[PDB]
Write a protein that binds this ligand. Structure first.
Ligand code: FE2
Length: 525
């Protein structure tokens, strides 16, 4: 049986998200008092903000959208606010300059990921960011980020877009993976391609809790590399270079911004915090592979930089293949690479020209989207909350972003790993952590994540108490599915302006519309 209306043509190209799912959602609005199952912990007082790529218009401008990437689509923020056991939800697109152009024209006007030579001529000199990868609340300001532009600011309650580049960074870009230092409170980050397309320039900065840039430095990467993420330590910001290179000639010819290169080693740039000269920066190298995200970093008792990350032993973004014929044939032959969670040691006393030691395998399972207890951000940390392919219950042949059906709570100090299974016919997305109280022990509290109930065409938020990581205490049940996203963050109400007085949904007025005389009821009858 085929439903006759299902053979009527659609004008939509296949617009995937990182999970591989391709259903456009695109709604903007609210649900007040979202249905829950179980008991919402009274200790949750804040908002889980998650951001997702969800092209608002069918992305047909270049090559009919055939080469759209899962990381391309217009950023939309979902907010789930927990207060006193009750949850509200709001979904809204970021009003990026790109989104505004395309909605006003009711037309796709942009081409390939990060390639202005494939956008419509009238928009080539716009900010092309879709602000779709991560969010942060810093200095009272709520930001949507994507690494090919500065951030867009949004109201944290209505999600209305307020402006661009709120911290007035001088670079053309800001990472979507800045880190909020637990010691200083600074937002510590960088922007690469910081002087425009295919530039090697990197701008490092720290923005203090009042919104002021208090430390910065201009430097360069060894090649124009895809510097997605970083790790913060007490004395360093360490940039993590993936083995992709940008080529302006390729982009002018209409090809992809990035191409994977098997000959590039994973490379790290150490930036001493508050450095005064680019001469203080050092480049360190291992071997080829793709460490997608850091959990965090710290310095050990001997001052050595320790960083945990995912590690895919090959290209986890196969939609940006190599440039050369020989390397393309290797990618196709290899298919899905081995994927693990690992630990790197960079000893600053060593000669940085010597190859780094091989990383230690921490989890021998495909692992991605790690987060930590941010009370330990930029210092020694132990807990990591990791999105995993659950051992013996997962499909190792899926790309790392497409088979994530569990969570792990890894504790370095104890050496233990606990496991949460999302369920049969379920995926689960990146976890976030909220401490049980401000002075709870590290990693004691609640873990939240979005679950795709694939057989039900719905999405839910699960809530897990770390005292039993294997069991959900509550589920927030939406009446529909949302896109599978990239990152999200738990943002405590304490740091959210006006959290005490403003909900995600504004209340209707108190006064009745109708006069007293219209009631059916008479107290005398
Ligand atoms: Fe990321």
């Amino acid at each position: 049986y085929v439903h006759p209306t299902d053979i009527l043509p659609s004008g939509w190209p296949t617009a995937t998200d990182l999970s591989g799912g391709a259903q456009p959602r695109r709604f903007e609005g609210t649900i007040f008092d979202v249905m829950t199952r179980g008991t919402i912990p009274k200790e949750l007082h804040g908002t889980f903000y998650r951001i997702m790529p969800d092209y608002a218009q069918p992305p047909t401008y270049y090559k009919g959208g055939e080469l759209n990437a899962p990381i391309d689509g217009d950023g939309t923020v979902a907010a789930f606010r927990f207060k006193d056991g009750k949850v509200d939800y709001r979904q809204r697109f970021v009003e990026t300059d790109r989104f505004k152009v395309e909605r006003r024209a009711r037309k796709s006007m942009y081409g390939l990921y990060r390639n202005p030579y494939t956008h419509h001529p009238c928009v080539r000199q716009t900010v092309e960011s879709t602000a779709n990868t991560n969010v942060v609340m810093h200095a009272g300001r709520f930001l949507a980020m994507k690494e090919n532009g500065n951030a867009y600011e949004m109201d944290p309650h209505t999600l209305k877009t307020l402006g661009y580049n709120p911290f007035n960074l001088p670079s053309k870009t800001m990472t979507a993976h800045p880190k909020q230092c637990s010691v200083t409170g600074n937002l510590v980050g960088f922007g690469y391609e910081a002087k425009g397309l295919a530039t090697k320039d990197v701008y490092y900065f720290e923005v203090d809790p009042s919104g002021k840039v208090v430390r910065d430095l201009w430097l360069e990467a060894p090649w124009c590399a895809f510097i997605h993420d970083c790790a913060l330590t007490p004395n360093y910001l360490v940039l993590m270079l993936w083995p992709f290179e940008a080529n302006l000639e390729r982009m002018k010819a209409g090809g992809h911004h990035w191409a994977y290169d098997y000959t590039k080693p994973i490379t790290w740039i150490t930036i001493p915090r508050g450095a005064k000269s680019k001469d203080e920066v050092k480049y360190w190298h291992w071997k080829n592979g793709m460490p997608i995200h850091t959990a965090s970093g710290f310095e050990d008792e001997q001052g050595r930089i320790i960083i945990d990350s995912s590690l895919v032993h090959g290209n986890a973004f196969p939609f940006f293949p190599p440039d050369s014929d020989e390397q393309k044939k290797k990618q196709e032959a290899d298919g899905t690479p081995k994927a693990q969670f690992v630990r790197w040691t960079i000893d600053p006393r060593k000669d940085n020209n010597e190859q780094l030691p091989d990383p230690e395998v921490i989890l021998d399972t495909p692992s991605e989207f790690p987060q930590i207890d941010n009370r330990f951000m930029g210092v020694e940390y132990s807990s990591a909350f990791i999105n995993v392919f659950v051992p013996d219950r997962s499909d190792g042949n899926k790309n790392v972003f497409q088979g994530l059906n569990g969570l792990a709570h890894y504790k370095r100090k104890e050496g233990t790993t606990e496991w949460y299974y999302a369920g049969d016919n379920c995926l689960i997305q990146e976890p976030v952590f909220s401490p049980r109280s401000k002075d709870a022990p590290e990693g004691d509290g609640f873990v939240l994540a979005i679950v795709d109930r694939l057989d039900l065409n719905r999405s839910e938020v699960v809530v897990i108490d770390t005292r039993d990581f294997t069991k959900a205490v509550a589920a927030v049940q939406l009446p529909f599915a949302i896109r599978s996203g990239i990152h999200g963050q738990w943002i405590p109400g304490e740091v959210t302006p006006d959290f005490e007085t403003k909900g995600l949904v504004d209340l209707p007025k108190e006064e009745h519309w109708a006069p007293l005389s219209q009631s059916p009821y008479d107290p005398d009858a």
